[PDB]
Amino acid sequence: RRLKKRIFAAVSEGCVEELVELLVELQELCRRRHDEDVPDFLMHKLTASDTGKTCLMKALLNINPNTKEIVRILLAFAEENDILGRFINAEYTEEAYEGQTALNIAIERRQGDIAALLIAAGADVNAHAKGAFFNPKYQHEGFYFGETPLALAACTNQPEIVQLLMEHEQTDITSRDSRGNNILHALVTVAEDFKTQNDFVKRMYDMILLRSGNWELETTRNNDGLTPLQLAAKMGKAEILKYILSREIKEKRLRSLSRKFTDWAYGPVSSSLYDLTNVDTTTDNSVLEITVYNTNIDNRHEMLTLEPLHTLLHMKWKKFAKHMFFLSFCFYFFYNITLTLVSYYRPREEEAIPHPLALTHKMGWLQLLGRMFVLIWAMCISVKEGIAIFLLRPSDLQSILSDAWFHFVFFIQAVLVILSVFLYLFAYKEYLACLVLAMALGWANMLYYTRGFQSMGMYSVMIQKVILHDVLKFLFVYIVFLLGFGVALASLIEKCPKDNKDCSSYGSFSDAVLELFKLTIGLGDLNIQQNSKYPILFLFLLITYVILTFVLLLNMLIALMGETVENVSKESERIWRLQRARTILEFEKMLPEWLRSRFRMGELCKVAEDDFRLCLRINEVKWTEWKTHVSFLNEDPGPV
């Protein structure tokens, strides 16, 4: 293998003369040495076995200003000895790198000129790469282009090569990779925001679709049942989603491939009929379901401006969800009042036994429907939220924000009511402690129903983000000081002469924690005389607790100050639109078949000749940029 290793060193450096020298020798060699299987042994003297790497690969992996040459001498050599098929179509063999061919290397190293040669020489254009570096799971183990040479040219912004590969036949544009993705899914995969990758996926996602001329690639489910449209929604790619929905192909013969059919235009005013094929919840998983109920991404706020949704969210509220949100509040109001107008009349007395909420049995009519409404609606929450418990594929944060703080307290409230009626039934006196939490949890949870009511809605967000993030810290350090300084003053106190009982406020530890607790809130009375060994030390630990406590309270107002000036005006108004969206859809999931169909949005359209699809009209006004409006669906400018 001396001739083998030296030719590898030849393509490496760039020595063309030294290459042509051994070029003759391998030509002189194979005629008489190891004949009768010439092209196999000849190839075997070019294969870097245990890797599959041939000379042509070794040439283009290592680019030098003298590289266009060494390719040509090997290609003309492949022509003479007739190995041109297996020569170019050879691939690596190891699992870490499989399928990587010559065309795969040339498209990466920006040698677009050499690419045109290898394609014309008969390179398998619809190649693949099913290795590990080419299908990583974690980041920074490799690069996912999509197991086609076309994708690597498009993902890496090589439009000249994409056009050339595209025009050449045998270029199956409807191909599919290992994980089922076609060329369009992969472009949705590798696409970041404008801070990162500039815009070229938006431009290259356009170029392939315009020329394709069919509703084929945009309607392909990879393996898990996802189109490029749905895939863009799940991963959280906002820029590409803005294009897919609001796509106008003004050039005729491809107006059919649009979703922005302009109904008409009279000067500044125009009417754009967007489409709602797979955006509404009529079918299975859609944008409006994925965009809202997803939690594994972070930018769900920015997506809900994209505007066959925002108009679509608002109209669902005006129709049905505004009412159902209020019909909810009236029953949940009547419930707590019922639970409360039992709790302050029957428990505040004792004869032998009161039955608190059980089957009334010797009470008037007023109290029958009272107690009965509690148990049925108590079980009703107790069941329902439990399904929301179960369908809780882990909300990435936790029980904490984005919804699940509230579905538990609803659940806990329902359990504690029914739990008590079981406790009381056997014998137990523990019924009262459960009704009282059932009130206090209930009243504080009426605060929940403030989201379809604006500015209050933003206020119920700010309280929540504040009782998760800053106050929880302040307690945790306020505990350790209180419990810390609590012992110090609870131990410095000494003998309580029984002749002078209740000798001091600070006695046991339990009293020290509270009489310090009353001090913090601004309540009670203080006298530095309490029976102690050191009245000088007994105060220094107290004035200590005043200062050290006080300092954190200033860390409080500034830590929220450093939170509110950055967040509120953008934070509250936007996540409010989010949680309001879940409320709309969650009601739409409830509705029966006949009632949902009646309230289904949309209006039919003749967007083109052989094309009827749903729509949603959104008028607008625009003055700054003008045109001689030519793209009309219907020429008559206006309604009717």
Ligand X SMILES: CCCCCCCC/C=C\CCCCCCCC(=O)O[C@@H](COC(=O)CCCCCCCCCCCCCCC)COP(=O)([O-])OCC[N+](C)(C)C
Ligand Y SMILES: CCCc1cc(O)c2c(c1)OC(C)(C)[C@@H]1CCC(C)=C[C@@H]21
**Considering only residues 1-60, where is the footprint of a copy of itself by CB under 8 A?**
none
272: which residues sit within 8 A by CB, 6+ positions away? 260, 261, 262, 263, 617, 618, 620
Q: CB of residue 463 vs ligand Y: minimum separation in angstroms?
A: 6
Q: Give, as one character, the DSSP assignment of residue 194.
A: T
Q: Is 619 helix (H, G, I), strand (E, B) or coil?
A: strand
Strand partners, 5: none
Site for ligand Y in 532-551 (CB under 6 A): 544
Is residue 379 involved in binding ligand X (CB under 6 A)?
Answer: no
Nearest to 103 by CA among 136, 56, 63: 56
- Residue 96, Cβ density class (10 Å: 0-12 exposed, 13-18 middle, ≥19 buried): exposed
- How is residue 441 written in tokens? 């949890």
> Are 531 and 504 contacting, i.e. CB atoms less than 8 angstroms apart?
yes
For residue 570, state whether it binds a copy of itself (rule: CB under 8 A): no
Among 441, 462, 559, 585, binds ligand Y (CB under 6 A): 441
Angle at 388 between CA 394 and CA 601, to 5 degrees: 105
459 lies in the site for ligand X, by CB under 6 A: no
Query: What are the CA-CA distances from residue 196 to residues 158, 201, 232, 306, 606 (Å)?
Result: 18, 12, 17, 21, 40
462 binds, among ligand Y, ligand X, a copy of itself, none (CB under 5 to 8 A by kind): a copy of itself
Choose among ligand X, ligand Y, a copy of itself, none what residue 468 binds, the Cβ cut-off being 5 to 8 Å by kind.
none
Q: How far is the CB of 565 from ligand Y (least distance, A)?
A: 23
Q: Would you give the DSSP letter of residue 634?
A: S
Q: Considering the rule CB under 8 A, would residue 127 count as an interface residue with a copy of itself?
A: no
Residues 454-513 that bind ligand Y (CB under 6 A): 463-464
Query: Backbone phi, then psi, for 216, in 5-degree steps?
Result: -110, -55
Within positions 408 to 427, which residues make up the interface with ligand Y, using CB under 6 A? Answer: 409
601 touches a copy of itself by CB under 8 A:
yes
Is residue 602 marked as binding? Answer: no
Task: Note whether 508 binds ligand X by CB under 6 A.
Answer: yes
Using CB under 8 A as the binding rule, whether residue 155 contacts a copy of itself is answered as: yes
3-state secondary structure of 453: coil
- Tell me the C-alpha distance between 229 and 226, whole Å: 8
Binding residue for ligand X, selected from 5, 323, 473, 606, defined by CB under 6 A:
323
Task: Answer yes or no whether residue 38 interacts with ligand X by CB under 6 A.
Answer: no
Question: Contact, 200 vs 194, CB < 8 A?
Answer: no
| Sheet of strand 269-274: strand arrangement | 260-266, 269-274, 616-620
Q: How far is the CB of 486 from a copy of itself (least distance, A)?
A: 9
State yes or no: residue 484 binds a copy of itself (CB under 8 A): yes
Among 358, 380, 447, 475, binds a copy of itself (CB under 8 A): 447
Q: Does 410 bind ligand X (CB under 6 A)?
A: yes
Rule CB under 6 A: say whether 556 interacts with ligand X: no
Q: Minimum distance between the CB of residue 481 and ligand Y, rounded to whole angstroms?
A: 8
Residue 583 makes contact with ligand X by CB under 6 A? yes
Nearer to ligand X, 508 or 628 (CB): 508
Q: According to the binding rule CB under 6 A, does residue 483 interact with ligand X?
A: yes
Residue 409 binds what, of ligand Y, ligand X, a copy of itself, none (CB under 5 to 8 Å, by partner type)? Answer: ligand Y
Q: By the 8 A CB rule, do 155 and 186 touch?
A: yes
Query: Residue holding tokens 């505040």?
Result: 348
Q: Which residues contact 100 (CB under 8 A, 6 or more apart)?
A: 91, 92, 129, 131, 134
Q: Which one of the spans 27-35, 102-110, 320-328, 606-614 is the region binding ligand X (CB under 6 A)?
A: 320-328
Sites of contact with ligand Y (CB under 6 A) = 409, 440-441, 444-445, 447, 463-464, 544
Sites of contact with ligand X (CB under 6 A) = 320, 323-324, 327-328, 332, 340, 344, 380-381, 384, 410, 446, 449-450, 475-476, 478-480, 482-483, 487, 508-510, 513-514, 517, 520-521, 583, 586-587, 590
* Bind-site residues for Na(+): 522
